[PDB]
Every structure is written in structure tokens, then in C-alpha cells.
Write a protein that binds this ligand. Structure first.
Ligand code: NA
Ligand code: NA
Lengths: 324, 329, 329, 324
């Protein structure tokens, strides 16, 4: 076989279930971020999810994010790669992602087209169905979201998957985007691992997704603080708890703030340790190194490692036969 | 396995001569740098030279993306500092529309060369490139400071050997040595005629009044960017670059390609340094990488305008490299 | 995994309206056919519509090659006769800049449909395509002969339902039924108004004076090519096509896209037949395939000129499909 | 591995030697010819050489012949494909082939830049060396030719390979281009199989190439004659003799006239059997069928069959290390 095409998310998460592991999802915004992800996936022989933020299209240009993924597939033809559109705010957005060539899209139907306003359950199912139709015609995978309110209930997860049958459901269990996830180390009362168990036990065949799952490594917070940065006491989701969640049906884990912290830490340390250097390539290399280590830490702790060459890709063309 | 719609360097510099302007040559480095060039060329309607020093898939794909997003901007993809014919031939296979066979330095890339060696390797590359329509930039005379270990005679190109080198090779563009060098530490004081021989450009131009001249080491090293760097945690001693006014003079005397990279490194390093101190709570790299794009883009715009590049992108009807073959036979 | 620089159909037909011309739509079939279209469009400086009926890599690659060899010719890649929304959506993913959701026929592609069904499938495709900037051609009324088993009422589009169909769907272009059909056997005699309702075009145009009309089955079936075929071994009975003069009239009444393929099949089949008999010792296929290119190219040139397409290629500044999205929201 | 790139000729002919088979080389001029070759290579699981004639660039457009090969590689990713430039008349020609992306070129140094005039031995070595230099820098393979005069001698083959070390040498043993190869069935006195043995025994490590090796199948000559064609008594090289030549070091066998005859025969028969059809696709399909059978007949009789999936491709980039 060959990995000159992307694989669907659905295939990759089916593999996660069959072999009891999870896949961390990393955001790509530019060249150095794409290289760190791929170099880590090569080091651990893991399949890859790379996502584009809602604003990644605007920041980088749509041709560039298409062409970064193409370059990655050329340079590491042995790594299966899912290209996933994160946090689509309307069906029309996800359709442009499909036209651009993504193999997986998220229609965040919990929030309105404005991207902030929580929505009626009916609205959620409507735009999520809407996107499901145009994506499954192509073989493209769909992640939807129910819940914003802040805690997902079991019965509505069961009904929402029945009404839309997305390939993956993102659930709310007390995490959020950014570095200020918790004022204290998160305990069972602020990170509801028990609701995951309940939702998994009710839908033992649906792939669950966790947003805002950066651990926020403390040593990087300290490194930033020493070299001119100032980040107050905040905490993320410990890797230990995310490992338990994978044992209970979590297959996709969105991590973004950790890579931002590793990058900002590396530049701050380097720019102070060598104040005469001005070649960006010199500290860009020390962001690839530090981001790559975070991705390696996750691929291994999440069981993603060792699975890249166990996957026989199925084209998005043949994935149409899985839905119709 | 993808095809780029590049224009040849020869076409672009012929246009620069016909319309009395010069083209700054920027390095492709990553997405942020690539966007700055193209955005600046878009805002100024300038044709583009982008260079790659001799992963490989990423540089090809950054350029392909660039051409898609701005299909109306002509783009030369030039291979800088080629150390041997075989290197240049691989660049031709990769799809470059322009190569530099730097014959002033050997295959090791450091040892200065005999005139005979220079002509031999340069002829080799001209032969295989002009078979393709690809342009060839050569160099007689060695880059390096005139204050500071090569002979003075080696670091300064002589009129007679430029005339002989161009006759023996017919490169599309010639790189000359008049006291510039790589990096930010080009000059200890504002360069005057005894350490930056603008008159030697003039002399060479009058001897070869139809050959395109190239200037390496031509970052201005803007003092304002040195200040921003020093103020926000940087430590860069007193140094000086090539003033814009002199590059403008050089264009009136046949300089059509002006290689610029240190200025983009300084603009980026300053922009990140200022932002990281001005907003120490931000850690989204995109937040300050955005400023490298803006500050690099401004440097490019300033050069496109000061060099007369602006306003020429849509005066150029591209000629395919296949059609450029007929210009040589 | 390759990107084509296509223009949208909506842009192209807006230009046809603004400058009172029509565009013949040819099928991509193979290299020889693809070259004929592009060469004819090159000689006449016309924009191009090329269609693919709903291997797949080869059609994509013939078009990519075409764009490379003639980057100055705007090209619409249109998916003809789509039988369901899901088909059209896959075409959008493949990179078409225009799709036809033929709602007059069902998913089986043969059974005529309810008005309600037609609007539903057509709205579905308009919604997902205009999210992309992709154009949508629809059809109300069924193709078919008026001499020869559908009702007369079904084979002829009525003014009132065209007005209602365009209001309910806002397609970029509408295919109407006025008595044309596929193939060479369109008419038993030279078509007059009772078997080819040119006046119904006029009527529909005056009711929808800003919507682009499409004519299927519009090969002229040139009698001279019928003769060449019959003389050199062929057996084609007495039949007739759509005369060029009437298509010219139809363009004055809102017909902007004219689908032509049978004429290219006849031109090729005649050219090979004449050559194989005129030179029975030749067996190099290229020797007579060369004549299919010439004769197909002449048909295309004749249409580009007779339809006013000629001379417009460089009046068109392409708009990316990304930028076409803003025209719909 | 993956076959999204072309492989070098040198690698493919090294495989022919290691496993004692030969590879027929077919000319591509348009879409239907490319499909017949690839469909036959798929049917027999054989690696492929496709060549472009000196005039194929002019006939088809350089972007189209690049894009036909790209399409073939997409549609049959399991078939290794050499893209070879046949009969280059000057170094400058072969260089444009390298820039277009060919993985193998022929510098026919036996004839001048005019393409008809026989040349001095010195001229031959000069342009052949010239092309060898620019091609081996890239990993691209080179076929050269010594002899036009009409019979290749052993000593000059040995010296010519020493002076140039092409990857393959095309030798003259009494064949020629076109259908009029022999007035009578070729015997040992007009098809010098013995000189092949002698040349092979002198250079038991060089890949030998045979031009003008169409067999000219008689039934296709008859089919043409019945349906309006008129081809006098002429004959080709029997497959039986070409099989012996492969046992003695022939690895590349150029076949072109046979595919022309199969195509012209199929159209002539179809256009007479159905004089009312005018859709070219209808008789184009009956040229794919008939050409495909000829290619299958050769892949199997030449031992090419069964080798496509035994080949682990080496990039043209890594092929540079084989020369420098
Ligand atoms: Na330089
Ligand atoms: Na039609």
C-alpha cells in the first residue's frame, strides 16, 4: 500500500477502538508545527491527526495549509495522516474544508454560526445532519458536539448520535480551551471522568472526543516565567486521567495550548541565553525540538505509538461504501 | 511530482533593464516569510525572486502555494550558491527556473578558485541550463570585507576579468565583489567609497553595458531594527549595512538583482523581541509570528518601491521555460 | 492530489451576457480531443467550457496539462448530467468549478420527475456548491424529439414553470427543452419552428431576462461530414441537426452555453474514414489521429467565432472559487 | 513502499539480469496507448517501460505526456514505471527530457543532430558522455548506441561502454524501424543472434537494447488487408528469436510497429463491421483491447510477468549514490 492520500478519521478511530488506544490531535498553523508533529509521529511510528483551527485558514492561506499537508505526506510516506477541520461554525464552513481536501470535519453545532452563542438542541442536530450529508457522500468523517449546559448528559448523547450518527462526538466534562483550565489541580469534581464512563457504557460503539485537553506542563510554565514570561498559577488535565479516559472510549484528544507553551518557552529561553543571535531559524529549531517531545510524550502515553504501519489505508472513495 | 508556473530570471532581469529598475531577492524560509514576500509583492505589484540555498518537499510546496494564492505575480525560483555543476543540474531537475553556479568558491564552498576553474564549471552549467531555458548567475571576484583572510585583489572584482568572464561564459547575470559580505557585520562605519566600491560597479557597468549585475550581501541592516533588538533584550554591537541610496545608485549602473536576507532576520527577531516583552502573558506563537509577517513585509515593500520593482508585475507576459529555449539557439 | 486554476461557470456566463455572446461546451474525451478544443480556443482567444459526464485520474490530468500549455485561456471544468446531490458533491470534492444537477430525470437518469423532486435535489446542490463558489446548472423540462415516449408537454419547457423553477432554486444557468435531443438523429427535416421551438427560447428569455439559458443536444450535425462518412465506407441515413443560425438567434435570447459533442464525433469519424481510404498503406495511428485534431479543431473554431466567444479570453480576469463565495452570501 | 514516483531504468534492468528476463519498451503517444500498456502490465503484474518518441513531445505536448504518466501512476500505484526518452538526437534534447521528469534517456550518438547522418566514433562518445554526465548527476539512466556500418562489432561495443559507461547499449544486429523489416522470414544470416552472443560474452555485465523489434503479427496484416488496408509481404522478428536473445543479455526490446498495426487493424475491422457507428470511443475501445493483448503476449513471453511486486523502488535521488 501507499500513504500518498489522507485516510479518513473514521478508519483511524476504528483502529483506536480495535487496539485500545487514543490519538492526540494537534493543530497545524505553520511549517515548524507540521514538522514537529510529523517528526514525532515518525519517531514513535504513530498515525497522525493534524487539525486546522477555524482561523488557521485565514492566518496561513488555504493553499498553504493544503500544501503543508501535501509536503508532509511526501516527506514521510509511511505515516497515515488524517487532515481534520476543527470547530466548523456552520455547514458552509465544513463544505469549504471538504472542497479543500480535508478527510475529516467538525461541525460544532453546540454553538451558533457566531461561534460563541450556545444553541437549541434542534439547531445542533440540523447543522450537524446538514454537514453529515455532504461529508459522508465523499467519505469524509464528521465530528459533532452536544453540550456547551457545561456538562454533557448521557441521554442526550445517545439521542444526538441517533439523530445524526456523526463518526465522533465531542463531549463536555469540565475542560476548556486555553491555559487557564483550573484554579487548582483538577479532581473528580471538576474533571468528570465518571460521566465519560457513563456515556461510553451507554454508547459502547461511538468514538468520543475531548476538547481542551492540554495538560499544561508545569516545567514549561516555569521556563516561561523565568525568561520574561508571566503566567499565573493555572493547571491542565494530567496525562494520567487522559489515559483512563482512553480506556473508556476516548479516541480523539485535542491538544493545542501545550504546543503553544512549549514554543513560547523555547524562544524565550533561547533569546535570553543568546541575545546576539537574530537568525529565526536558530530558535525555530528550538521549537521543533520542544514541540516534538510533547507530541512524542502523548503518542506513547496514549498508545498511539507503533500503529502507523499496522494500518492498511482505505481511500475516501471506498469510504463512501461505508455510509451508502 | 507537481509543476510550478515560474518565469525565467533572464526574462525578469531583461525587463528590469528595459524599465530601469532592480529586483530584491529574498529567501524562502517558512510560511511566515513566504507570505511576507508575496503580500509585499502583491501590495506593490512587483515581480518576485525567491531563493533556496543549495525538507526539500516543503520549499517546493511553499512556492506552489504562493503561485496559487497570487497567480498574477510572476515568480522566479532561483537556486543560490551552487557549489558544483552536479548540484545545479539537480536543481534544474527539481524545477528551478534559475541557478547560480558560484564559481568563485570551490565545491567545498569556501576555497577561492582559479579563473580557469571558474569558467569551466560556469560554462558547464550554462550549457545544460540554456538547453532548458533556465537562467544562470555566475560570480567572478569573492565576497568579503575590505576592512578585514583573502587578498584585497580577490575581494574586489576587476573590470578586465569581468569582461573576460562574461565573454567566456555568457551567464544571464553576473555577481560582482565590491566589498559586501554576508551577515549583519558588513561595515564598521557607514560605508564610504574606500570600503564599498560603488564606483567599481560603475566601472564594470560601462565596460559590460548590457549584462545584468548581481549584488550579494546587500542587506541594509536597518539601524532602527538594531535599536529595537537592543532595547528588548538583544545584544548586537555597533555595525552597519549597505544603505538603500547606494543600492539605488547601483541599479542605475546595471545592478538588477539585490540579495536580501539579514534584514528579514533582523525584522523578525526584533518584532518577536518587542512583542514578547510588550505582552509577556501571551504564548500563542501566531500572535507574535503575525508581527514577523508585518515587519518582514514592510521591509520587502520598502525595497520593491525604492528599487523601482513596484508596478511591473502586470507589465510582464510570462514566457514558458520551453519558449525560453529558443532565445539561446 | 493536484490543484487546477479553473474559473467558475457563473463568472464566464456573466461575461457572455455582458458582451452578448455564447460559449460552446465540448466534452473532454482523450488527448486528441482535448488538444483540438484548446488549440481552437487558442487560435480564437476564447474562454473554454470542458465537460465530463458523471479513468477518473486521466480526465483530471488532461485538464491540468491543458491549463499548463495554455495558462492564458480561462477554463471552466463542468460536471454534466449529475443524477443526484451525492454525485454532484463528489464532483465538488474532485475540484469541478461547475456542476449540473439534472433534476428533470431521476437518480436512475431516465425517469422524468415531479416539479417538487426537481426543486428539492436542485436546491440541495445549489446550497453545497454556492458554499464553494461552484456554479450549478439545472433543468426543467425534458430533452427529446417533438416528432417522436414522453408527452409533448414534458419535452417542451413552459414559461411559467421556468420562472417558478429559477425562483425556487436560483441556479446559475438553466437548461431548457425546446425539441433538441442527444445524438445525430435530432430532426427528420431541417428543423422549423414546430419541431425546434426557438420562439419558446424567446418567450422564456423575456420572462427571465437575466438568467443564463443552456441548450443541450445542439450539435449541428454538419451535412458535409455526413457526406464524407457515407463516401468513405460509412452508412448514416438522412438526418439533420440544429443549424448554426438558430443557435446564433438563441444567444440573442439568453442562451449562453451550447453543449456540443456529436459534431466532434462526426468530424473525427469522417476524418479517419477519409484518410484510411485515401492512404490504405499507412498504419501509424498518429498519422490519421492528426486529422481528427484538425477537423475537431475546425468545428470548435467555427463555433467560437459564430457564437461570439472569440476574442474574450484576455478580457477575463479570473476570480478564484474562494472569492466566488462572497457573491452568494 | 509506494510507486508514486518513477523508477530508474538501471534499477529495472538490473532486476531483469538478476532474474533472467527482458522488458519490452512501448511507445506512448496518447491516452488510449497508455491505458493499453498499463492494463496489460496490471494483467501480467509486470514492471513497465514507456517511451516517448523524438516526435512524441511535438505531437502530444510536453505537459500532456508528463500528465499521462502521472495519471497512470495514480491509477495503478502497484506497477513500477520507467519513463524513457527514446532516440534523443543531441545532448540538449536529453536535457529537456530530464527537466520534464523522465527517469531514463537515450542519446542516439550513432546518428548526428539531424537524426539521419551516421557519425564518427568520436562524435558518438562525445555526445554520449555529455548526456551521461548530466543524467547520472540526477539518477537518470542513459541508453546510447554504437553502429548504424549496419552490424555492430564486439571490440567497439567493449570500448564504447568503457568510454561512456551508459546504463544500456543499443546494438545493431540487422533489425530496423517500421513494418518492412525483411523480405523473407528472417534467418540467422539477416538477424545476427550470434553477434548478440559474442557481444554478451564480451560484456557479461552490460544491458543490451534492441531497436526495431516488432514481430509484425501476420494475422493483423491479414486483418488490415481484408478491411481496406494494403500491406505487402513483409515480416518481423519472431518472438522465438527474441526469447533466445534475452537468454543472452538482451534486457530492453523496443516494440512500436506491432502496436500501430494492432490499432489500425482494429479500427479498420470495426469501421467496416459497423458503418453506422461514429462515436470514436466505440472503436478506441477496440484498440485498447487489441494493443493490450500484444503487450500481454510480450510481458509473458519475455518473463516480465510476475515481477512488478518483487521490485522495491529506489528513488532517483538515491540513484545518484550509485554513480558518484
Ligand atoms: Na549570497
Ligand atoms: Na447534455
Amino acid at each position: 500500500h501507499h500513504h500518498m492520500a489522507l485516510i479518513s478519521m473514521r478508519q483511524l478511530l476504528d483502529h483506536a477502538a480495535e487496539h485500545n488506544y487514543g490519538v492526540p490531535a494537534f493543530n497545524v498553523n505553520n511549517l515548524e508545527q507540521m514538522r514537529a508533529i510529523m517528526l514525532a509521529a515518525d519517531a514513535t511510528n504513530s498515525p497522525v491527526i493534524v487539525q486546522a483551527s477555524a482561523g488557521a485558514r485565514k492566518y496561513a492561506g488555504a493553499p498553504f495549509l493544503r500544501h503543508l499537508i501535501l509536503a508532509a505526506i511526501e516527506e514521510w510516506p509511511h505515516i497515515p495522516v488524517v487532515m481534520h477541520q476543527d470547530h466548523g461554525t456552520s455547514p458552509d464552513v465544513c463544505q469549504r474544508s471538504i472542497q479543500l481536501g480535508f478527510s475529516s470535519v467538525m461541525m460544532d453545532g453546540s454553538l451558533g454560526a457566531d461561534g460563541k452563542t450556545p444553541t437549541t438542541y434542534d439547531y445542533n442536530v440540523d447543522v450537524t445532519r446538514q454537514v453529515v450529508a455532504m461529508a459522508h457522500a465523499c467519505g469524509v468523517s464528521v465530528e459533532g458536539e452536544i453540550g456547551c449546559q457545561l456538562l454533557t448528559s448521557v441521554e442526550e448523547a445517545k439521542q444526538f448520535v441517533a439523530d445524526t450518527n456523526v463518526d465522533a462526538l465531542a463531549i463536555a466534562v469540565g475542560t476548556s480551551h486555553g491555559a487557564y483550565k483550573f484554579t487548582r489541580p483538577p479532581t473528580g469534581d471538576i474533571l468528570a471522568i465518571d460521566r465519560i464512563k457513563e456515556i461510553h457504557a451507554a454508547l459502547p460503539n461511538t468514538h468520543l472526543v475531548m476538547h481542551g485537553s492540554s495538560s499544561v506542563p508545569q516545567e514549561w510554565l516555569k521556563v516561561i516565567n523565568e525568561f520574561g514570561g508571566n503566567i499565573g498559577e493555572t493547571y491542565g488535565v494530567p496525562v494520567e486521567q487522559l489515559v483512563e479516559a482512553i480506556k473508556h472510549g476516548v479516541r480523539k484528544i485535542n491538544i493545542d495550548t501545550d504546543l503553544r507553551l512549549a514554543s513560547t518557552g523555547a524562544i524565550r529561553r533561547f533569546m535570553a541565553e543568546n541575545p546576539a543571535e537574530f537568525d529565526p531559524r536558530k530558535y525555530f529549531a528550538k521549537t521543533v525540538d520542544s514541540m516534538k517531545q510533547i507530541c512524542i510524550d502523548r503518542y506513547e502515553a496514549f498508545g498511539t505509538a507503533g500503529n502507523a504501519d499496522k494500518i492498511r489505508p482505505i481511500s475516501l472513495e471506498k469510504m463512501v461504501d461505508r455510509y451508502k
